[PDB]
Amino acid sequence: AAQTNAPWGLARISSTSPGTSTYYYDESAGQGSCVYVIDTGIEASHPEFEGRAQMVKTYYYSSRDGNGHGTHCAGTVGSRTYGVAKKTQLFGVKVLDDNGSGQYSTIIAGMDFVASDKNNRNCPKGVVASLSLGGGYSSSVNSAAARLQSSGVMVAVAAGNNNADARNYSPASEPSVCTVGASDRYDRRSSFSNYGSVLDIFGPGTDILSTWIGGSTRSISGTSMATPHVAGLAAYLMTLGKTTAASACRYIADTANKGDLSNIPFGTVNLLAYNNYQA
């Protein structure tokens, strides 16, 4: 399949070079897979989701997204126009409030919820979780992310936006999950992106167009925007039978575009997520 005039980030994940505007992908498009978006919620009624999104859990007075951040991340995973995996099922878990903040105990409860809740859903091709959040180092937060991965879920997490070594942030610093940095349309590391030996991969993170609350759209930047490109790619590859939840991070790194990014500090991987689709 071919999507003309796509957002730059979708075109980049299906290309060997920067500067193109068509997204190429196998028409199976993640059907039969599931992606949990653990964030501020999802506006499931947005026309871009076509009935494939629903809220499954909240820790606050409402399950609605009063912020917009979680709706934007879900759109990069699986909306019709702005998503990587256009036929996946999306499940929302609201662990952040409408100001975008949340206690670490609530975030841990949310990750334990997904590890059990997958047994109540129909996901024959496999299960993914997208975590666009983070804070300072916590051994308890890292252990929760490791349990979720062990249970058979592909876990993707944001590196953080401090222009620093990701070793000092959680869940970014957990070894067994997929830690994602951010790049821009000219193949530079984003100026805010964290780095270090704990990173596994980079994805598009500067000026990313996706869905917003109120049935609208907008372009915003961060490692939060890079993370759902990788979660959507994992769902797409599991549907095609190329990999499984336990080895998807290794498969994505083995098949990535190598040595193409600028301003990568010595010691950090120079790997950009790529679907390797041949029309």
Swiss-Prot record:
The chain holds residues 106 to 384 of 384 of the full protein. Binds 2 calcium ions per subunit. Belongs to the peptidase S8 family. The keyword Hydrolase applies. Disulfide bonds join C34-C123, C178-C249. GO terms for molecular function: metal ion binding; serine-type endopeptidase activity. GO terms for biological process: proteolysis. Ca(2+) 1 binds at P175, V177, D200. It is an enzyme of class 3 (hydrolase). Its EC number is 3.4.21.64. Residues 7-279 form the Peptidase S8 domain. GO terms for cellular component: extracellular region. It catalyses: Hydrolysis of keratin, and of other proteins with subtilisin-like specificity. Hydrolyzes peptide amides. This is Proteinase K. Its cofactor is Ca(2+). The keyword Secreted does not apply. Keywords: Calcium, Disulfide bond, Hydrolase, Metal-binding, Protease, Serine protease, Signal, Zymogen. The lineage of its organism: Eukaryota, Fungi, Dikarya, Ascomycota, Pezizomycotina. The active site is at D39 (charge relay system), H69 (charge relay system), S224 (charge relay system). Hydrolyzes keratin at aromatic and hydrophobic residues. It comes from the Eukaryota. Coiled coil: none annotated. Ca(2+) 2 binds at T16, D260.
